[PDB]
Amino acid sequence: FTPXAP
Amino acid sequence: FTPXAP
Amino acid sequence: FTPXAP
Amino acid sequence: FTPXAP
Amino acid sequence: FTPXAP
Amino acid sequence: FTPXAP
Amino acid sequence: FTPXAP
Amino acid sequence: SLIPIVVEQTGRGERAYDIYSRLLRERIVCVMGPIDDSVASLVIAQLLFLQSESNKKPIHMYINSPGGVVTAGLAIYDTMQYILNPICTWCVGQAASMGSLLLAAGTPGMRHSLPNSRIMIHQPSAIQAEEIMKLKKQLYNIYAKHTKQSLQVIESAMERDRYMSPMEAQEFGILDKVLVHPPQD
Amino acid sequence: SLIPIVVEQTGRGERAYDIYSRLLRERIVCVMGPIDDSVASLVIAQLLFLQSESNKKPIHMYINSPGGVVTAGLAIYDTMQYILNPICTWCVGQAASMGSLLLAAGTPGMRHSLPNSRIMIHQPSATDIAIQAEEIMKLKKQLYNIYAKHTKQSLQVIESAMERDRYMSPMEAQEFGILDKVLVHPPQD
Amino acid sequence: SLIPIVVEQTGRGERAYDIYSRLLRERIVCVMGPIDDSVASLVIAQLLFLQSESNKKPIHMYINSPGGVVTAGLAIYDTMQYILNPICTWCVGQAASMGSLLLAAGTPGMRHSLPNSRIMIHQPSATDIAIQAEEIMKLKKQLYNIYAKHTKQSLQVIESAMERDRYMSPMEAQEFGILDKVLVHPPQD
Amino acid sequence: SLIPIVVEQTGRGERAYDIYSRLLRERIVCVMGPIDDSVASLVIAQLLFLQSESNKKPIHMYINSPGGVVTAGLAIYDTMQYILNPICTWCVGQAASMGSLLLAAGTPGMRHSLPNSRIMIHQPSATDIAIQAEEIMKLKKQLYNIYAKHTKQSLQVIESAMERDRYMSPMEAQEFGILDKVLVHPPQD
Amino acid sequence: SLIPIVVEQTGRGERAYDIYSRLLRERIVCVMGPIDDSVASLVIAQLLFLQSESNKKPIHMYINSPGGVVTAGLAIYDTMQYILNPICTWCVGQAASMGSLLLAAGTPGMRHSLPNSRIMIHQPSATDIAIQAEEIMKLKKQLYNIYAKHTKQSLQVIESAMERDRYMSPMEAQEFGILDKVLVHPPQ
Amino acid sequence: SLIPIVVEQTGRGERAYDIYSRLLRERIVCVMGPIDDSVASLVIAQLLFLQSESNKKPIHMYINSPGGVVTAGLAIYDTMQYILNPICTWCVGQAASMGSLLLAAGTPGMRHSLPNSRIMIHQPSATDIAIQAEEIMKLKKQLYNIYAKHTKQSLQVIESAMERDRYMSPMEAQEFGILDKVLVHPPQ
Amino acid sequence: SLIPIVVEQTGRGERAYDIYSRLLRERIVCVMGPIDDSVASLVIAQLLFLQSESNKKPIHMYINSPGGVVTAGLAIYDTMQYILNPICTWCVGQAASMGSLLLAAGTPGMRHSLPNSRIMIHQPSGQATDIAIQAEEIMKLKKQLYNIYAKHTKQSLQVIESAMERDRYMSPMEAQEFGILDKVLVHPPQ
Structure with missing residues (x-):
């Protein structure tokens, strides 16, 4: 799930 | 399923 | 199944 | 089984 | 679990 | 089981 | 279990 | 039920x-x-x-x-x-x-059977009542198209709890040829 | 059931x-x-x-x-x-x-179906656990909002359609805002 | 039950x-x-x-x-x-x-059995879906045809015999025309 | 069921x-x-x-x-x-x-949820041996202290909250201290 | 039953x-x-x-x-x-x-047993599909001939032996014609 | 359940x-x-x-x-x-x-627990094939003796303790002698 | 459940x-x-x-x-x-x-136990035969066991049969006195 996780 | 998906 | 399928 | 099958 | 094991 | 079988 | 097995 | 493995020569190894x-x-x-x-x-x-x-x-x-x-x-x-x-x-x-409906939906002339097969269009006997009906009319229409039989001759046959021979199935419009061996010429 | 193996192209070998x-x-x-x-x-x-x-x-x-x-x-x-x-x-x-919800949530214009498909939004009757009255109602309202958002219908329309225990044809689902195209064959013309 | 693995010097490798x-x-x-x-x-x-x-x-x-x-x-x-x-x-x-119907459908002269085998042409008293009375008989009748074709026996002789709940020795299966030679050890000619 | 195989290209071959x-x-x-x-x-x-x-x-x-x-x-x-x-x-x-407890245990500022998720800190009415009443209470008090540490809420507030048999919207869970951000789409910058 | 893997050194690696x-x-x-x-x-x-x-x-x-x-x-x-x-x-x-029939059927002189094995020719109680009484009697006689052929005993001695619900020792099985040698340790 | 696979990088990695x-x-x-x-x-x-x-x-x-x-x-x-x-x-x-008997049995100084573990030395009310009562007390006395050796406690203290149907916090486990250190984070 | 894999290095690893x-x-x-x-x-x-x-x-x-x-x-x-x-x-x-029968059958001098093991010579009344077995056949098997324990414990048949009557486990020290094993080892010797 990027950005932010990663 | 091409065309159109893909 | 050849011939004819294939 | 040979001979004869094969 | 390092440090200390290992 | 050798010898003898084999 | 060595020594002695093996 | 172990399925076996076969060797092929392909274009490379x-x-x-x-x-x-x-x-x-x-x-x-x-x-x-x-x-x-x-x-x-x-x-x-x-x-x-x-x-x-x-x-x-x-x-x-x-x-x-x-x-x-x-x-x-x-x-x-x-x-x-x-x-x-x-x-x-x-x-x-x-x-x-549904097995016989897939048989029938082959492109015409290329629907076959072996001599001893059995074909059934009768439906075997969770949703609302109207939907089973809407689903069966859907089956009627599909068989109609591919057999070139009419709607009333399909709703009659799909009601006889019976199987057809391959040759009876050919007459009805479900399949095209019935082959015991590959054809000659 | 056994899943078959296919070999491709390809730039590697x-x-x-x-x-x-x-x-x-x-x-x-x-x-x-x-x-x-x-x-x-x-x-x-x-x-x-x-x-x-x-x-x-x-x-x-x-x-x-x-x-x-x-x-x-x-x-x-x-x-x-x-x-x-x-x-x-x-x-x-x-x-x-839930399957019709995922269908309705594709990006607009790209939501298709085949001719004979059936489409239901009504909802049985499940859950991992269980469950209070207020929570299941909370969960439905979340479905009300998502169906409204993507079908561009109103709440009271979505809710009324959901109370009806029936399936839609592909073209009826299209008129409701769930689908865009019903293709029998690949298009163009 | 694990199946044994065998390796072949031929190959090639x-x-x-x-x-x-x-x-x-x-x-x-x-x-x-x-x-x-x-x-x-x-x-x-x-x-x-x-x-x-x-x-x-x-x-x-x-x-x-x-x-x-x-x-x-x-x-x-x-x-x-x-x-x-x-x-x-x-x-x-x-x-x-059906096992003996397959045995009999071998190409003539090439249908064999080991000495102590048991051959039964009688049908047991299944199908895939439960089935109507007229359909069982159709299925039985084509069992009679196929059996009559490869044995060179008449529908009447196949229709009896198939009524006896019996099993035949391989010798009897030969005389009846289901198989061709029973072999204890491989022949010399 | 069948877990798909993916091939990455980074990248010796x-x-x-x-x-x-x-x-x-x-x-x-x-x-x-x-x-x-x-x-x-x-x-x-x-x-x-x-x-x-x-x-x-x-x-x-x-x-x-x-x-x-x-x-x-x-x-x-x-x-x-x-x-x-x-x-x-x-x-x-x-x-x-315990799902929501693990969500709460992430690094502060780094605990996220998607918009339709449901968060519950209520325990069900969950252990390997059958265990005494006293020890069930000790386990729950352990839960109390952990949720208190990671929401920075009071034990009374935590104990009061867990008594209620209900789920939370992610927004309510953020206000409560269980998580930090709710995201529908990736953030800008 | 985790079957172990052994590595041996054949041609050519x-x-x-x-x-x-x-x-x-x-x-x-x-x-x-x-x-x-x-x-x-x-x-x-x-x-x-x-x-x-x-x-x-x-x-x-x-x-x-x-x-x-x-x-x-x-x-x-x-x-x-x-x-x-x-x-x-x-x-x-x-x-x-059926296990002792396969035992008895090895080529003569080459049928062996270890010293504490147990051999029974009595039949228990077979059959993939439940069968008629005359068919089970035809199989029992196929068993009788096979045992009499490889033990060099008479049908009558085989038949009344199989009526006894007992095991034999490897020694008895050899005197009876099922085994040839009972080996505790490899021979000289 | 799917067990993940990791690919190592170290030399020929x-x-x-x-x-x-x-x-x-x-x-x-x-x-x-x-x-x-x-x-x-x-x-x-x-x-x-x-x-x-x-x-x-x-x-x-x-x-x-x-x-x-x-x-x-x-x-x-x-x-x-x-x-x-x-x-x-x-x-x-x-x-x-038996889980805490193995925990208590690592070398002195190297017995650890994370802070929210539960440690129980009470035996539950277990056996491959059932056993005579004299046998179950023989096994239990072997437990006593082992726990006594590694907690450095007395048989009375151990027996008295194992009679209580309760779990211990890791700090309690440490004071009893079952483990040496309770770590929240790695030390420095 | 999951069985671990280990890597060894040889003249061909x-x-x-x-x-x-x-x-x-x-x-x-x-x-x-x-x-x-x-x-x-x-x-x-x-x-x-x-x-x-x-x-x-x-x-x-x-x-x-x-x-x-x-x-x-x-x-x-x-x-x-x-x-x-x-x-x-x-x-x-x-x-x-049958476990302790295999224990007792190792080469004399080479039969060991760890100190907290339990050894039992008594037979149970978990199957003990493949097919159902007549009374004389089960006595023959038990006499086959009697002879084997006696040969390997260097005890008399009477001492063996009396011992197998007792529904008890032995310590590794007892099992050694009786002739079932040779050495109880807490740690490797020397």
Whole structure:
């Protein structure tokens, strides 16, 4: 799930 | 399923 | 199944 | 089984 | 679990 | 089981 | 279990 | 039920396949046993894949089924319409309920059976009442198109709890040729 | 059941995939059968992986499903929203309850179905646990809002249609805001 | 039960097979235990594969079956007729019901049995879906035809005998015309 | 069921993993379904592995879980407090009971949820042996102290909250201290 | 049952077999547990394959079996006769019912047992499909002939022996004509 | 359930290790869930292997276990005692019944627990084939003696304690002598 | 459940083994759990394979077992006798019923136990025969067991039969006095 996780 | 998906 | 399928 | 099958 | 094991 | 079988 | 097995 | 492995010579070295993947290489799609969503999505995956390797080369769909879930069966039927390839269908053993509807939906002239098969269009006997009805009228229309029989002659036959010989199935409009051996010339 | 192996092209020297992994390579994600937390886990993993490969190229989501656990179904929907890619949805066989919701949530214009599919929004009758009266109502209202958002219908229209225990034809679902195209054959003309 | 692995110096280099793939290599199709749609798929696949390697080389079919699904057994029987190859059938242990109908459908003169086998042409008192009275009889009648064709016996002689709940020694199966030679050890001419 | 195989290209030639092992290489750890000692041991194994790749690079825990065996969730909790890495938790679907405790145990500022998720801190009416009343209370008091530590709420507020049999919207969970951000789409900058 | 993998040093490097496939490389065929159609299938496949590689090199059949389906046993016994190789049979633990028939059917002088095995020719209580009374009596007589042929005993001595619900010692089985030698340790 | 695979990079570094096999390379033996004879086989196998590789480099037992069969647990215990390596024991989740006997049995100074573990030495109200009552007290006295040795407590204290159907916090476990250190984060 | 893989290095490595195949490479045969025909067949195959690699190198038989099928245990016993190799038996956990028969049958001097093991010579009243068995046949088996324990414990048949009547387990020290094993080892000697 990027950005932010990663 | 091409065309159109893909 | 050849011939004819294939 | 040979001979004869094969 | 390092440090200390290992 | 050798010898003898084999 | 060595020594002695093996 | 261990499935065996066969050796192939290909264009380069030597490939090995399980016997069913080898048959897919010749563009053959086995449709065996009861039809359910899991089977439906496996057949459709093989259909889309084969077309992707050739828009034009015929696909052979071998059938031995006592039917199954009507929506899973329809899913395959619609995939057969959408796909551009010719589709040979080939009834081995039996084709009942959705099984016989897939047999019938082959592209015309390429719907076959072996001499000793059995074909059933009668439906075997969770949703609301109207929907089972809406689903069965859907089956009536599909058989109508591909048999070129009319709606009232299909709603009559699909009510006789019976099987047809392959040759009776040919007369009705479900299949085209009945072959004991490969043809001559 | 055995899953067959297909070999492709290819610039490496062949590769051999199980049939389903090869469909992954063409950016297709099969959502089949009941939707539970394991199915949602594997679908979300597939969406994330695809976006990581290209946050640009369409992703094609083929749906044949009678429904499933609503929280798992929401987990997929939220993932569809979050990723950037256009998402085509393609209904095959049927899409009922949670399955029809995922279908309606493809990016507009790219939501198709085959001719004979059946589409239900009514909702049985499940859950991982259980469950108070207020929570199941909370969960339905979440479905009311999502169906409204994507069908561009009103709440009171969505709610009334959901009370009716029936399936829609592909063209009736189109008139409601669930689909865009019903293709018998690939188009153009 | 794990299947043993065997390795072959030929090759070329050397390859390893499960012992059944190693038998098939050599054109042997094993038909063991009850015949259902799955066995019929497998046998038919093995048959069609062997014919595609050579429509002239003989195919050996080793039978040890108590019978099985009538429609699946016919499906195998039809494929045996449709393919061009000679078919040696070899009854090991027992051939009953559809199992003995397959034994008898071997190419004439190439139908064998080991000494202590049991052959039963009587039908047991299944099908895939439960079935109407008129349909059982149709299925039985084509069992009579097929049996009459390969034995050179009359429908009346097949219709009796099939009423006796009996089992025949291999010698009797020969005199009756189901198999051709029973062999204890391989012949000399 | 069938776990798809993906092929990455970075990049000596190309290597292939199942999609879940591929996510682990992006340092993602999936916590799906009920937590028992077996998932505790897998999650813990993965956390420790990633910490040995890098003590510094964050680790991401995607949580979709209805809860599970208390002592196995604490084994997970304790492990995630012990490693050096920051941990982003990310709640898709739901985080109920020990699920929501693991969501709450991520690094402050790094606990996310998708918009339709449901968060519950109520415990169900969950342990390996049958255990006395006194020890059940000790376990719950342990839960009380942990939620209190990670929401910065009071024990009375926590104990009062968990008495209610209900789920929370992610927004209510953020206000409560369980998580930090709710995201429909990736943030700008 | 986690089958261990052993590595042996054949031409021309090193290959890894599971331990039973490795015993098959030495021309050894294991007959363990109740004998049914599947067991008979694998055993026959192995005997056919092993003669395929050499029709002169002995084949060793290690038997620890309490019996099983009579037709399946007969299928094995018949392929033991058809193939041309000598066959040593070796009994560990027990050979009872169809198991002791396979034991008795190894080529003469080459039928062995270990000293604590138990041999029974009495039939228990077979049959894949429930059968008629005259058919079970025809099989029992097929058993009688086979036992009388390989033990060099009379049908009447076989028949009243099989009526006794008992096991024999390896010594008794040898005096009776099922075994040739009972070995505690390898011979000189 | 799908066990993830990790690909190692160290020198000739490829090899797809499974996650647990990879922890084993680091000399970690996982002891998860209820201890039966098969778990005891696997644990001993790993212990004996790790010592074979180095009878000096420490070995680490990570313990999350509600207990299990007493003789399987004693099999592991005696193997810990028999190998020469120092053994670090590490309790996550819980260590109950034979689980805390293994925890208490690592080398003095190297017995740890995370802070939210539960430790129980009370035996539950277990056995491969049932046993005479004189036998169950023989087994229990062996438990007493072991717990006494490694907690350095007296048989009275141990017996009195094992009579209480309760769990211990890790700090309580440490004061009792079952473990040495309770770590929230790695020390420095 | 999951069986670990280990990597060893040889004149042809690298190489990967499942931990149990690895232990077999050190000539260790694990006899674990209830003994039945399938265990007896797996154990006997290891013994024969190991002697064929060397009929002189010792063979180590680690035994943690509550007993099993008598005829299956006797097949193992008879194969221990037949092969030439010295056999070290090592009892960990327990050896009950046919388990302690295999323990007692190792080469004299080479039978060990760990200190907290439990050894039982009594037979149970978990199957003990494959097929249903007549009373005279079960007495013959029990006399076969009586003779084997006597030969290997150097005790008299009367002392053996009296002992097997007692429904008790022995300590490894008792089992050593009685002649079932030779050394109880807490730590490696010397």
